[PDB]
Write a protein that binds this ligand. Structure first.
Ligand SMILES: [Ca+2]
Ligand SMILES: [Ca+2]
Ligand SMILES: [Ca+2]
Ligand SMILES: [Ca+2]
Ligand SMILES: [Ca+2]
Ligand SMILES: [Ca+2]
Lengths: 207, 211
């Protein structure tokens, strides 16, 4: 045989089917087997019997299947396999089509009112379904969007953009005055420059 | 003949470099040395692509940028240890595939428009436009949807105007324009790719109410 590495981007558009590669091996008839061919999901990839042109029949979702393993078969017209089945690996390449997702809707934390600026309070966390191995499409930066109340100061807390750890930023926390803060926290991919989602951190001020 | 399949590589890849692409081969029989020529190999940008001289493994050495170069045209060479080419150079085409790494940008910071006060709801006012440097032929990464983010003043109500999400045409949505109370509106308009769901930017549309 001879089998090149094969790639298809997810979320393609336009006319289908789309040509991938021509598989070459008495007239020969080409077949593919495997999950994605004759097994679920059935018919995502096909091959032309006579030409050996391997094709994709629909847009792909990498977050469903990121890698397909198929086998090509070559059968003469008289009915004999003229070659061993050849392993074909198709790599589905990533597009940034998933926003980060916070693991909780409302994270809860507490802080001692006398805690010095720079004191760690709590941690927020988010996942991103996109390709964190080969891309930055899942590279999350955390930021604080808003603080309620805006008292005594507007920015009482800060979040570490890599780790999602929230710390005391400035002085002035006081249980008697404002016992609770609701922060809107954001997670944004492409290292903060990309798609984003929000959630809340509720911080209660202790003695 | 040579054997050369389609080669593609996504832009903006991270991780360890270099990365394997495909193995280049010829059926010839002495010890063969492989090499590559072209822009991206031995010509500017030099060394983006390299080949292992004895194995024929073609590799990329760094992240690519489709908006700089979307397609490379290289040639592979096969030379015996005695110094004679043992095949004719083979064209190798490398397609750089798109990532959504460009946010849309409006063609102006402030678009200016104007509307007669008694214009019936549904009347076209002005147009906003944005472009996107990503691949609009093959992806949704440059597929812009227009929306109105905000209207100032919010009087006599909000939603005085609307925007066609495909065309950027701003029209009168509801009645109530009154130049002697609210002489102008500043709309914050957004263009967002992936059909409205993706990367976004904002601009202003300032509308002067005529009589
Ligand atoms: Ca997907
Ligand atoms: Ca993502
Ligand atoms: Ca994806
Ligand atoms: Ca780019
Ligand atoms: Ca874009
Ligand atoms: Ca791009």
């Amino acid at each position: 045989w001879v089998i090149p590495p094969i790639s298809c981007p997810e979320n393609e558009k336009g006319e289908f089917p789309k040509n991938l590669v021509q598989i070459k091996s008495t007239k020969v008839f080409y077949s593919i087997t495997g999950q994605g061919a004759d097994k679920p999901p059935v018919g995502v990839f096909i091959i032309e019997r006579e030409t050996g042109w391997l094709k994709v029949t629909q847009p792909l979702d990498r977050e469903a299947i990121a890698k397909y393993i198929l086998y090509s078969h070559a059968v003469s017209s008289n009915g004999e396999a003229v070659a061993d089945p050849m392993e074909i690996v198709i790599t589905v390449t990533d597009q940034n089509d998933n926003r980060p997702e916070f693991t909780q809707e409302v994270f809860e934390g507490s802080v001692a009112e006398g805690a010095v600026p720079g004191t760690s309070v709590m941690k927020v966390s988010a996942t991103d379904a996109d390709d964190d191995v080969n891309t930055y499409n899942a590279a999350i930066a955390y930021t604080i969007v808003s603080q309620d109340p805006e008292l005594p100061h507007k920015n009482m807390f800060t979040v570490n953009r890599d780790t999602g750890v929230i710390s005391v930023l400035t002085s002035g926390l006081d249980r008697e005055s404002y016992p609770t803060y609701t922060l809107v926290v954001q997670a944004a991919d492409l290292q903060g420059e990309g798609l984003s989602t929000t959630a809340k951190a509720v911080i209660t001020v202790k003695d």
